[PDB]
Ligand code: HEM
Ligand code: HEM
Ligand SMILES: Cc1cc(N)nc(CCc2cncc(CCc3cc(C)cc(N)n3)c2)c1
Ligand SMILES: Cc1cc(N)nc(CCc2cncc(CCc3cc(C)cc(N)n3)c2)c1
Ligand SMILES: Cc1cc(N)nc(CCc2cncc(CCc3cc(C)cc(N)n3)c2)c1
Ligand SMILES: Cc1cc(N)nc(CCc2cncc(CCc3cc(C)cc(N)n3)c2)c1
Ligand SMILES: OC[C@@H](O)[C@@H](O)[C@H](O)[C@H](O)CO
């Protein structure tokens with residue numbers, strides 16, 4: 090079967106065949122689309138087909154499909170699964186697997202970069218202290234004094250589900266949030282629950298607006314342990330505006346390194362429950378989402394006040410005007426400090442070139458429009474009028490529930 | 501099977517049961533989501549009529565009543581005999597309002613029950629259609645105090661006698677390919693404009709020429725009519741702060757009126773059913789003015805603002821976009837022509853959606869269309885999960901008639 094997608098701006102039509110390789114389900118049916126829903130211990134039996142599907146893909150990618158080496162590897166994995174109920178990936182397979190999980194990540198606008206991913210193999214890690222060292226090293230490598238490099242660190246795979254490695258933080262670097270007795274929040278409201286957990290575990294909170302959270306790390310299914318990332322490894326950018334000299338006095342800053350630490354990496358049916366990965370920011374992630382969501386730093390009003398915009402009616406578009414200036418300040422600030430950042434026009438233009446290339450060379454590029462279109466100025470970016478098809482390819486990154494909900498406390 | 505929708509901003513969770521009444525297909529499967537794709541007999545007719553009449557009688561608290569049964573009986577007899585049936589005026593009005601209520605792509609549905617329905621099923625000729633449409637335009641326009649309206653022409657019979665408005669909207673601007681290679685006017689309307697000239701329209705050849713209506717009655721070849729110029733309310737676009745903005749020579753029309761969709765009620769198909777409301781400002785200032793394939797005015801505005809256009813990261817496009825949208829709203833408000841900004845409209849839609857969940861068990865909604873084309877995440881619909889599904893009565897896309905009509 091062939092599926093067509095049209096671009097309503099250019100009239101360019103593309104043909105998707107890659108969707109035939111999709112396995113997992115979307116949440117949608119013939120009767121209902123769940124495209125805007127955010128969230129719509131394997132046996133041997135189910136494991137070997139998943140392993141074989143992966144190894145076939147890997148050997149095809151290296152132009153060794155059906156070779157003795159391919160056949161020998163299938164046999165080797167078969168025997169390992171029948172004997173030990175699981176198997177280990179070769180380092181080459183692990184690298185290929187992590188790169189493809191990114192390539193397949195339908196919500197990621199940054200995928201033009203997918204083949205440039207540094208993979209740190211942490212499968213020899215056994216303790217939380219060991220995890221801490223690996224993570225510090227990832228942060229230092231990825232930060233590279235502001236010349237950001239994409240990276241992923243991969244800890245040991247799931248075994249029986251009672252020995253999982255987990256990073257309890259949602260991102261490696263993120264700011265604390267503190268709910269006050271008067272119902273206001275100091276710092277980042279997104280992180281109040283996790284901050285309370287850290288405090289309960291023994292973290293001495295500075296209780297300021299931009300306190301870098303400690304790492305809370307679980308190895309081999311043990312209770313998690315707290316570690317502070319060395320402050321000298323955490324690159325941050327004070328936010329200022331190129332024309333408005335008062336912008337700096339809002340006291341805003343953000344960290345340079347976006348590093349997702351709460352997702353599960355699936356490769357050939359194996360599950361890597363701790364696999365922190367990082368790239369660099371698109372400006373709107375900070376300037377729109379983190380600063381301007383009502384449940385985040387929520388700075389729109391203050392900014393608009395200082396610009397002396399007419400705030401008596403929404404039709405003056407004061408919110409829109411303030412939002413653009415905030416986003417200008419974020420890009421200006423990162424660029425001035427020589428910290429890698431991409432604006433939403435550049436990122437979406439590059440994504441469309443990536444997507445078209447993937448259609449030609451791969452037969453498709455699964456993409457989630459809801460997440461791919463930036464959260465401001467949508468229609469003036471080239472992804473808005475691009476039709477997309479969303480489907481699930483493996484290897485993949487998957488959502489997992491926060492570990493405080495599932496963890497069995499040992500004491 | 502019962503479904504939850506969460507708002508990620510307010511944590512409020514709503515439960516949808518209405519989707520279980522959904523009938524038509526979405527285009528998605530368990531394997532693939534097509535949520536961002538724009539276009540994803542006597543035997544057949546009675547179940548559809550019954551489904552509709554059942555919902556109608558339930559709405560007036562008379563389900564299972566003698567009047568309910570009698571009407572079902574009457575409609576059955578009429579279908580068995582004539583291969584179709586006619587709606588009562590009450591049923592026609594109910595069906596039209598519910599087609600709007602069910603329109604998953606419409607952010608304006610808080611207004612759904614306040615729709616003026618003009619029954620034009622007695623219309624027989626294209627000149628008759630012209631008169632009805634002029635009256636609709638005048639009523640809806642109401643000297644700038646716009647009122648929602650729909651005008652419903654005769655239903656489809658054998659499909660060889662369709663009523664159709666060939667225009668995509670009742671009021672829209674012509675587009676003309678230039679010897680230059682450039683396009684003058686609205687590039688969206690180049691093909692339809694050519695058809696109009698081919699059918700004998702004397703084109704003025706300007707940037708904002710209101711297109712004539714091409715009306716098709718009873719399956720006949722369409723005929724040309726000009727809307728009286730004095731019935732077409734337009735707004736010149738100026739800016740409250742930038743004196744030079746007026747010098748761009750921009751204007752737009754006050755009345756947004758869709759004329760190319762098919763209204764389905766109780767299995768009956770109304771192929772000509774122009775309907776109109778009032779604008780949300782981004783429709784003009786973002787879509788019509790700034791789409792690359794439309795009037796595409798971003799560069800000119802940015803230049804007049806003297807922004808740094810050397811690099812995308814100055815956000816010059818975003819700055820000019822906001823200013824264009826400020827000018828659209830200011831202009832309509834100053835001339836006392838109804839318009840709603842995207843903050844106000846989306847706030848209203850959220851309130852509407854909560855009402856619909858509580859009173860009706862759900863509200864089908866297409867997030868891709870509901871979220872405004874600028875400043876998405878600062879509006880309350882962005883963080884609102886929505887379920888998209890198809891309920892009838894409905895408005896449906898139908899192919900442009902020149903691809904279909906046999907002359
Ligand atoms: C190199 C620069 C990168 C940029 C500019 C970028 C950009 C983004 C953005 C803007 C989002 C959506 C966030 C939002 O809508 O608020 C996203 C999501 C995501 N990206 Fe990337 N990305 C990059 C690198 C990476 C890397 C290295 C990986 C993995 C190796 C990755 C995998 C993902 C995944 C799995 C998601 C969905 C996350 C979730 O569900 O929470 N991206 N990306
Ligand atoms: C009264 C004020 C109204 C407002 C502010 C409004 C708003 C809108 C907007 C902004 C869109 C999408 C346009 C875009 O995304 O570029 C839309 C679509 C739509 N609306 Fe409304 N609307 C109104 C009245 C109506 C009425 C009166 C009806 C029918 C009786 C209607 C039915 C529809 C339908 C069927 C669509 C999808 C059209 C298509 O597929 O092309 N709306 N509405
Ligand atoms: C409920 C829920 C589900 C889900 N799949 N993801 C989330 C978190 C969404 C999220 C929020 N802030 C930040 C991110 C990171 C996106 C991101 C990731 C990377 C690697 C680089 C980059 N520039 N940006 C993701 C929440
Ligand atoms: C666990 C959790 C709870 C909560 N209340 N909110 C969140 C964050 C939800 C959230 C808010 N803004 C942005 C995002 C990023 C994902 C995202 C979501 C949507 C709808 C569009 C888009 N472009 N990107 C996520 C997470
Ligand atoms: C290929 C295609 C499919 C489809 N379903 N609709 C379209 C037209 C989209 C479209 C473009 N401009 C304008 C509209 C009208 C939207 C609209 C309608 C009404 C009644 C009021 C209001 N404020 N706005 C719709 C095109
Ligand atoms: C027949 C036809 C052909 C063509 N090439 N373009 C069009 C216009 C396409 C178009 C462009 N921008 C906007 C719309 C309105 C519908 C719309 C679409 C989306 C994706 C989001 C949103 N908020 N609203 C429609 C129509
Ligand atoms: O305070 C805890 C939250 O940060 C956490 O629940 C995140 O929202 C979650 O991990 C999703 O990324």
Ligand SMILES: [Cl-]
Pocket residue numbers: 377378382464877
């Ligand atoms: Cl956001």
Ligand SMILES: [Cl-]
Pocket residue numbers: 468786787791873
């Ligand atoms: Cl648009």
Ligand SMILES: [Zn+2]
Pocket residue numbers: 117121122123124528532533534535
């Ligand atoms: Zn879907």
Ligand SMILES: [Zn+2]
Pocket residue numbers: 378382877883
């Ligand atoms: Zn947000």
Ligand SMILES: [Zn+2]
Pocket residue numbers: 468474787791
């Ligand atoms: Zn558009």
